[PDB]
Amino acid sequence: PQGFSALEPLVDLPIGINITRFQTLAYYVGY
Amino acid sequence: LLHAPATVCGPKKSTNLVKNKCVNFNFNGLTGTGVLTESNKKFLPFQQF
């Protein structure tokens, strides 16, 4: 959609571990 | 005591709230001086400052 949106925060999880890769279980992915 | 973020600590001391008297205060690390009164403006559910 061409509309505008605001992405408010939901939750913060402090774990302090390095992350380098991710995997999922149609979807768009950006960087 | 590791480099991981702290998740357990000691308790805090809370006191009574005062109004119409410009005194010192400390909410979540914020320290200043001034009068305290209610307001008509409303914040967002997540915003705190």
Curated annotation (Swiss-Prot), chain B:
Region span, Disordered: 3-25
Reported function: Attaches the virion to the cell membrane by interacting with host receptor, initiating the infection. The major receptor is host ACE2. When S2/S2' has been cleaved, binding to the receptor triggers direct fusion at the cell membrane. When S2/S2' has not been cleaved, binding to the receptor results in internalization of the virus by endocytosis using host TFRC and GRM2 and leading to fusion of the virion membrane with the host endosomal membrane. Alternatively, may use NRP1/NRP2 and integrin as entry receptors.
Assembly and oligomerization: Binds to host ACE2. RBD also interacts with the N-linked glycan on 'Asn-90' of ACE2. Cleavage of S generates a polybasic C-terminal sequence on S1 that binds to host Neuropilin-1 (NRP1) and Neuropilin-2 (NRP2) receptors. Interacts with host integrin alpha-5/beta-1 (ITGA5:ITGB1) and with ACE2 in complex with integrin alpha-5/beta-1 (ITGA5:ITGB1). May interact via cytoplasmic c-terminus with M protein. May interact (via N-terminus) with host bilirubin and biliverdin, thereby preventing antibody binding to the SARS-CoV-2 spike NTD via an allosteric mechanism.
Full protein name: Spike protein S1
Gene, per the UniProt record: S
Entire protein: shown range: 517 to 565 of 1273
